[PDB]
Amino acid sequence: NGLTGTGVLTESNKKFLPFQQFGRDIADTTDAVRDPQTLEILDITPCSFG
Amino acid sequence: FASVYAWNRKRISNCVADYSVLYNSASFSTFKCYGVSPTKLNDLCFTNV
Amino acid sequence: SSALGKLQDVVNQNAQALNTLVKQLSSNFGAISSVLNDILSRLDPP
Numbered sequence: 001n002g003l004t005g006t007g008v009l010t011e012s013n014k015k016f017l018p019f020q021q022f023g024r025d026i027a028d029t030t031d032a033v034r035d036p037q038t039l040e041i042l043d044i045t046p047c048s049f050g
Numbered sequence: 051f052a053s054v055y056a057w058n059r060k061r062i063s064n065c066v067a068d069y070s071v072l073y074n075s076a077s078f079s080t081f082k083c084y085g086v087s088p089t090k091l092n093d094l095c096f097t098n099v
Numbered sequence: 100s101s102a103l104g105k106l107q108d109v110v111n112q113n114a115q116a117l118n119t120l121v122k123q124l125s126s127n128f129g130a131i132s133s134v135l136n137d138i139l140s141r142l143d144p145p
């Protein structure tokens with residue numbers, strides 16, 4: 001719903017407080033989201049580069 | 051419609067708004083936006099309009 | 100077992116610089132946002 005990105009999506013275990021849209025990481029990169037339809041938290045690991 | 055000095059103000063909520071279908075209702079005389087192209091608005095999402 | 104500040108100092112200076120480099124990926128420098136998916140998918144290439 002607006003967040004555009006790339007990466008691997010994985011089942012989370014971080015208790016997104018009932019009111020937290022997403023997860024913010026130090027140095028400010030999106031690293032978790034909540035699925036709008038089912039409302040579950042998913043981590044967004046980065047693809048492989050090098 | 052309303053007069054200008056007491057201008058109307060509607061607030062839209064949860065809906066499916068197709069902006070391209072609004073774009074070609076085919077009678078307008080000014081359709082100008084600054085923040086964003088109108089055809090690209092068909093794949094965003096907001097909180098309040 | 101109970102002094103290695105030179106080594107500590109070095110090991111640190113580098114981390115403080117690498118963090119400042121990443122923390123700059125979230126400044127506008129005079130733009131509408133810091134995200135290209137907000138400037139891109141919100142405007143024309145022109």
Ligand SMILES: *[C@@H]1O[C@H](CO)[C@@H](O[C@@H]2O[C@H](CO)[C@@H](O)[C@H](O)[C@H]2NC(C)=O)[C@H](O)[C@H]1NC(C)=O
Nearest residue numbers: 001018019021034035036037038039040064065
């Ligand atoms: C959008 O619709 C889906 C279903 O189409 C909603 O999903 C439900 O979420 C609740 C959680 O409170 C579950 O108990 C239901 O079983 C879900 N339904 C289905 C069919 O999976 C979703 O909540 C809706 N969006 C919002 C914001 O409420």
